[PDB]
Paper text:
In this study, we solved the crystal structure of AK1 from the Antarctic fish Notothenia coriiceps (AKNc), and characterized its thermal stability and temperature–activity profile. To assess the structural basis of cold adaptation, we determined the crystal structures of AKNc and AKDr to resolutions of 1.99 and 1.75 Å, respectively, using molecular replacement. The Tm of AKNc was significantly lower than those of homologues from tropical fishes, indicating the thermal stability of AKNc is substantially reduced compared with those of the other three AKs. In the structure of AKNc, Val28 in the N-terminal α1 helix interacts closely (<4 Å) with conserved hydrophobic residues in the β3 strand (Leu91) and the C-terminal α9 helix (Phe183, Val186, and Ile190). Their side chains are found in the hydrophobic interior of the CORE domain, making contacts with residues in β1, α1, and α9 such as Val13, Lys21, Val182, and Val186. However, there is room for improvement in hydrophobic packing around the two Val residues (Val118 and Val173). Taken together, the structural analyses of AKNc and AKDr suggest that hydrophobic CORE packing is not optimal in AKNc, and is important in thermal stability of fish AKs.
AK is a small enzyme that catalyzes a reversible phosphoryl transfer reaction between ATP/AMP and two ADPs. The structures comprised the characteristic three-domain arrangement: the CORE (residues 1–38, 69–136, and 143–193), AMPbind (residues 39–68), and LID (residues 137–142) domains. The static CORE domain provides substrate-binding sites, and the dynamic AMPbind and LID domains close over the AMP and ATP sites, respectively, upon substrate binding. AK is a small protein that undergoes relatively large conformational changes upon substrate binding and product release, and has long been used as a model system for studying connections between structure, function, and dynamics.
Numbering used by the authors: 9 to 193
The structure:
């Protein structure tokens, strides 16, 4: 079972995914976490990825998809399903995933307003300092989300597997909608 979780920067994808892990026991893989682990290793690749992420741009498909596949294989013997958080972010990412790994059975669209996202991320940046959570980068991330990631939602509407959750609600209320969608599989 492969669930794609897609939504804008600060929409709440990670938060929902962690609640899914606690209740359903799925494996949460986050493209952003995997990339940041590479940056942390101090590799030369990590330095290149750090520069791209600091600017709010997309890392190349080849690198991100390798790391997702790497992480899925590492968990394959224990997982009863996967939550793929933050991948895909463009239609070609979904297609290559389906070529190289498998088809998703559900896409959870974590839908938040643009203003709400800016506020959440500005607050998180003030708190925890994540280097891409500054105002300029937030704006680029959000603009790129509108442009590149929204057509992913359409693709999977065509496929018939998108379920939208209202991420303007409180966290637990969103999670009731998430749980409905997952229970109905
Ligand atoms: N597939 C890909 N291809 C190419 N490049 C890629 C890639 N994936 C990653 N990258 C690169 O890596 C970078 C980082 O990607 P990534 O780490 O994916 O960051 P992102 O998508 O910008 O999303 P965040 O994780 O910032 O937000 P989130 O939606 O999970 O929200 P959270 O739950 O944390 O919550 C946000 C805040 O709001 C709070 N909150 C959450 N829900 C609610 C709620 N309902 N009410 C109130 N507060 C809430 C949370 O507590 C938190 O403080 C990308 O910009 C790109 O450069």
């Amino acid at each position: 079972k492969i669930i794609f979780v897609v939504g804008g920067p600060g929409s709440g994808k990670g938060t929902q995914c962690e609640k899914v892990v606690a209740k359903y026991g799925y494996t949460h893989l986050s493209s952003g976490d995997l990339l940041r682990a590479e940056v942390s290793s101090g590799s030369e690749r990590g330095k290149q990825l750090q520069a791209i992420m600091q600017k709010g741009e997309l890392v190349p498909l080849d690198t991100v998809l390798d790391m997702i596949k790497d992480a899925m294989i590492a968990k394959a013997d224990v997982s009863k399903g996967y939550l793929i958080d933050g991948y895909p972010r463009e239609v070609k990412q979904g297609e290559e995933f389906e070529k190289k790994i498998g088809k998703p059975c559900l896409l959870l669209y974590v839908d938040a307003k643009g203003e709400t996202m800016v506020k959440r991320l500005m607050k998180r940046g003030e708190t925890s300092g994540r280097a891409d959570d500054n105002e300029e980068t937030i704006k680029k991330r959000l603009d790129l989300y509108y442009k590149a990631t929204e057509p992913v939602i359409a693709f999977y509407e065509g496929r018939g597997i998108v379920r939208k959750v209202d991420s303007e609600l409180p966290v637990d209320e969103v999670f009731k909608q998430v749980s409905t969608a997952i229970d109905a599989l």
